[PDB]
Structures are given as structure tokens and as C-alpha cells.
Amino acid sequence: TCPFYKKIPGTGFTVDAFQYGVVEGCTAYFLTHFHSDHYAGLSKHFTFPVYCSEITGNLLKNKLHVQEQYIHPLPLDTECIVNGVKVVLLDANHCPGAVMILFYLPNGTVILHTGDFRADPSMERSLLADQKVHMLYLDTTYCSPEYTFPSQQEVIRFAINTAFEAVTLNPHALVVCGTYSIGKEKVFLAIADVLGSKVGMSQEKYKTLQCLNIPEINSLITTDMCSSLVHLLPMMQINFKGLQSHLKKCGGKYNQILAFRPTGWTHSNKFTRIADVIPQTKGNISIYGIPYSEHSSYLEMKRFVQWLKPQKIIPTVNVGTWKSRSTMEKYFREWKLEAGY
């Protein structure tokens, strides 16, 4: 059965609730972004209205085959009426097409559902600035102070500098980057850009990237592996066995692999700086784990919430244990006492 934190009171609406069958009372199903834990349950036989971004709607049609008549894309930053209720979609600074949803209830309550997000000070100058928000449905993935990681810009700088150095020392080195969902496209695009190459990938991944409205994408990616010196592979293949097997397939064109795994957080973050990160190596293969996050750090999350000053917070992540729930509730109270709301 559908959990309470996926339901929007005072409406016929649910958020990211496609794996519970026909939800009793639901006249519109919103989808925040195209990640499988959130779309789980959607398929070509779905017959209810789905509300989402243009980009999410491209992926629903092309990848899941949802029929067009049930896909309702909305523009961002624009007041829209859905089944008699004003809503706005905001950029969530997560993966391509990811949104936060503002609901303006008929009784006067305003609710923000963040979906998955990476909080940013720029959000303090969106349409959120313009009225009070009573209830916040919050992505609490990294809601604990140990969760530190660098800016996306610092991480991309590390990756660009590492790749350009290795390939300039050895022009016969191949760069490989892991992927298993949309998001984090800057990692492989920034590295291919410094090397003067397109990124090579499977037909299935090329198809996915052609749904994302990235400017000038036809100039940046390709299915011809032979012409490319940055290859994308499934995340499961980014290990010594998988990468050895891939190098065999390249027909003696290359004699060294440098590979990147963009993880979220890893406990090496508590001690080590981004400057100081070192790879795991075996022979002519080196693997870097780089902390490129599409979710808020603890400090970024705290700044956002202390700015927004909501009356009530409903977590949407880490809700399955009493210890987690109690931990999160303590931090919410600290924040509220420190700021005075």
C-alpha cells in the first residue's frame, strides 16, 4: 500500500507512487524524475495521467513506451492549473529533467515536494522567495553531518586534469567512465571535451542521451567506439576483470586504461581531500572513485531548510528505521532552535 509521505493532502495527487496499483482517490500521478526507484511500476500499459517535465516525458515515451495520450509535460517556472489546483515545477539540480513541485492547496496551505535534489543558494531566488511554505517533503539522503563532499566544479576540475595528464603522457591510454542511470553526464562530457574526442557508447545509452535536450549533443556523443577515446560502460563492468576484457576488444589500439566511477559519498571523504585522491591500480589499469554528488550535503540541506523556515518537515529518504527517523528529527529541531522559527 502507498505510504503517507507519497500523498499530497487536500488533493487527488500522488508523487512518485507507481508501484502500488490503482491508488484509491488519485486523479493525477506526478513523477519528479526518471530514476528507477521513483518510476518503479510504470510501463506501456499505464492508463492514468502522468504529470512531469518535458525531459522526463521524452524518456517515458521513448524508453518505457508509455503512450503519448497519458503524458502531460509542464514547463518550468510557470504557474499551471491541474485538476483545479495551481502547481509550479522548479529545477531540482539533480539529473536531467528532475523537478521539485510547489502545490497551492485550495484551503491556503502551500506544500513543496523536493523530489531528489541538490540544494543550492540559487534556489533562494526562484519562485520560492515569493510566499510562505507550510509543509516540506524533503530529500534527506545525506541528512547527517559526516556527509561532506566537494562542489561539482572542484570534482570536474580533478577529473579533467587527471585525464589530460595521463593521455598526454601516453597517447595510447583509453579513458572509461561508468554509468547506470541518467545523471552525472558532466563527468564524461568534460573529459571528452579536454581530449578533443566524442564519447562512445552503446545504442541503448545513446538513445537515452538523445532524450535529454542537451545543446549540441550530436557534436558530443557517438555509437562508433573506434573513433572515440572516451568510452562509457555499465557501472558493473568498472573493475579489473571487466576493464581487461574491454581492452581486449579494442584490437591493440590501446595499452592502458584510466577509469572513473562517480559514486555518491564514500567514507574516504571523512579524512581525505579531493586533491589527495588516489586510484586503485593493477598492471596497466587504474580506477578512480570520484565523489560527484547529485544530492545535498548535510550543510547545503541545513542552509536551505533554515532559509525556507517550513512549519512541518516530512522526510522521504531513510524512513525505514526508527534510528534513522529519530536522528533526522533531532537535526530538524536543532536547526529550528538555532534559526528561531
Strands 110-113 and 99-104: what pairing? antiparallel
Give the integer Cα–Cα distance in Å for 2 and 6.
Answer: 7
Q: CB–CB of 89/57 below 8 Å?
A: no
Give 31 or 82: the residue with its C-beta nearer to Ni ion: 31
The distance of closest approach from Cβ of residue 116 to Ni ion in the complex, given in angstroms and rounded to an integer, is 4
Give 90 or 285: the residue with its C-beta nearer to Ni ion: 90
Cell, residue 8: 499530497
Question: Could you count the other beta carbons within 10 Å of the beta carbon of residue 182?
Answer: 23
Q: CB–CB of 56/31 below 8 Å?
A: yes
The distance of closest approach from Cβ of residue 181 to Ni ion in the complex, given in angstroms and rounded to an integer, is 8
The distance of closest approach from Cβ of residue 141 to Ni ion in the complex, given in angstroms and rounded to an integer, is 9
Q: Judging by beta carbons within 10 Å of its beta carbon (0-12, 13-18, 19+), is residue 321 exposed, middle or buried?
A: exposed
The number of C-alpha atoms within 13 Å of 326 and in the hemisphere containing its C-beta is 3
Give 35 or 246: the residue with its C-beta nearer to Ni ion: 35
Give 115 or 242: the residue with its C-beta nearer to Ni ion: 115
Give the integer Cα–Cα distance in Å for 301 and 138.
Answer: 9
DSSP 128: G
What angle in degrees, to the nearest 10, is found between the helix axes of 152-169 and 185-195? 40
Give the integer Cα–Cα distance in Å for 112 and 136.
Answer: 5
Please give the residue ranges that form the binding site for Ni ion (CB under 5 A). Answer: 35, 116
The distance of closest approach from Cβ of residue 15 to Ni ion in the complex, given in angstroms and rounded to an integer, is 13
Cα 38 to chain center, whole Å?
A: 11
Give 36 or 107: the residue with its C-beta nearer to Ni ion: 36
The distance of closest approach from Cβ of residue 137 to Ni ion in the complex, given in angstroms and rounded to an integer, is 14
Give 35 or 231: the residue with its C-beta nearer to Ni ion: 35
Phi, psi (5° rounding) for residue 280? -85, 130
The distance of closest approach from Cβ of residue 110 to Ni ion in the complex, given in angstroms and rounded to an integer, is 24
Give the residue carrying C-alpha cell 486523479.
27
Give 92 or 259: the residue with its C-beta nearer to Ni ion: 92
The distance of closest approach from Cβ of residue 305 to Ni ion in the complex, given in angstroms and rounded to an integer, is 19
Give the closest residue to 141 by CA, choosing from 123, 113, 117: 117
Give the closest residue to 257 by CA, choosing from 280, 223, 234: 280
Give 6 or 231: the residue with its C-beta nearer to Ni ion: 6
Give 116 or 300: the residue with its C-beta nearer to Ni ion: 116
Give the integer Cα–Cα distance in Å for 174 and 243.
Answer: 10
The distance of closest approach from Cβ of residue 95 to Ni ion in the complex, given in angstroms and rounded to an integer, is 6
The distance of closest approach from Cβ of residue 169 to Ni ion in the complex, given in angstroms and rounded to an integer, is 37
Give the integer Cα–Cα distance in Å for 238 and 236.
Answer: 6
**DSSP SS3 for 10:** coil
Give the integer Cα–Cα distance in Å for 323 and 328.
Answer: 9
